[PDB]
UniProtKB/Swiss-Prot annotation:
Belongs to the BET family. Phosphorylation by CK2 disrupt the intramolecular binding between the bromo domain 2 and the NPS region and promotes binding between the NPS and the BID regions, leading to activate the protein and promote binding to acetylated histones. In absence of phosphorylation, BRD4 does not localize to p53/TP53 target gene promoters, phosphorylation promoting recruitment to p53/TP53 target promoters. It is linked to Cornelia de Lange syndrome 6: A form of Cornelia de Lange syndrome, a clinically heterogeneous developmental disorder associated with malformations affecting multiple systems. It is characterized by facial dysmorphisms, abnormal hands and feet, growth delay, cognitive retardation, hirsutism, gastroesophageal dysfunction and cardiac, ophthalmologic and genitourinary anomalies. CDLS6 inheritance is autosomal dominant. It is found in: Nucleus; Chromosome. This is Bromodomain-containing protein 4. JQ1, a thieno-triazolo-1,4-diazepine derivative, and I-BET, a benzodiazepine derivative, have been tested on tumors with success. Treatment with GSK1210151A (I-BET151, a I-BET derivative) has strong effets on mixed lineage leukemia and promotes myeloid differentiation and leukemia stem-cell depletion. There is a cross-link at residue 40 (Glycyl lysine isopeptide (Lys-Gly) (interchain with G-Cter in SUMO2)). Signal peptide: none annotated. Changing residue 86 to G: Found in a patient with a neurodevelopmental syndrome; uncertain significance. Chromatin reader protein that recognizes and binds acetylated histones and plays a key role in transmission of epigenetic memory across cell divisions and transcription regulation. Remains associated with acetylated chromatin throughout the entire cell cycle and provides epigenetic memory for postmitotic G1 gene transcription by preserving acetylated chromatin status and maintaining high-order chromatin structure. During interphase, plays a key role in regulating the transcription of signal-inducible genes by associating with the P-TEFb complex and recruiting it to promoters.
Length: 106
């Protein structure tokens, strides 16, 4: 697989170039953003920088484990933030695009 190639070359590449991707390209910096409770509430932090490094360095057992990471990134956003927040709308747009690309997964 093949399916992991698609996740790197197609899904990650598409999401990474998107206008709203930049706050998700690296882990949430709780000190810099003044969110001292972030790491108390979110026990499995996830971001596209970590996903990219895992795809490049053979971390994943399979493509489903990578898809789980993308979903954890989105739901961590929905758990920590309020509905309607700008970061939530940015995550929602990325999630919609992610579901489109994942529907054409080989
Ligand atoms: C309830 C309070 N929550 C927050 O304020 C909050 C911020 C973030 C960020 C985030 C992370 C970075 S970073 C990676 O450089 O550390 C930079 C900018 C970030 O968000 C923005 C902040 C201001 C903007 F104007 C626009 C933003 F996009 C990411 N994610 C995944 C979150 O869930 C989250 N919540």
């Amino acid at each position: 697989t093949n399916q992991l190639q698609y996740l790197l070359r197609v899904v990650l590449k598409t999401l990474w170039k998107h206008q709203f991707a930049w706050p998700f390209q690296q882990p949430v910096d709780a000190v810099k953003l003044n969110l001292p409770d972030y790491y108390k509430i979110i026990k499995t932090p996830m971001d596209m920088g970590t996903i990219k490094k895992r795809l490049e360095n053979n971390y994943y057992w399979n493509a489903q484990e990578c898809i789980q990471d993308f979903n954890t990134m989105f739901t961590n956003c929905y758990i920590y933030n309020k509905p309607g927040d700008d970061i939530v709308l940015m995550a929602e747009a990325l999630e919609k695009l992610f579901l489109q690309k994942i529907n054409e997964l080989p």
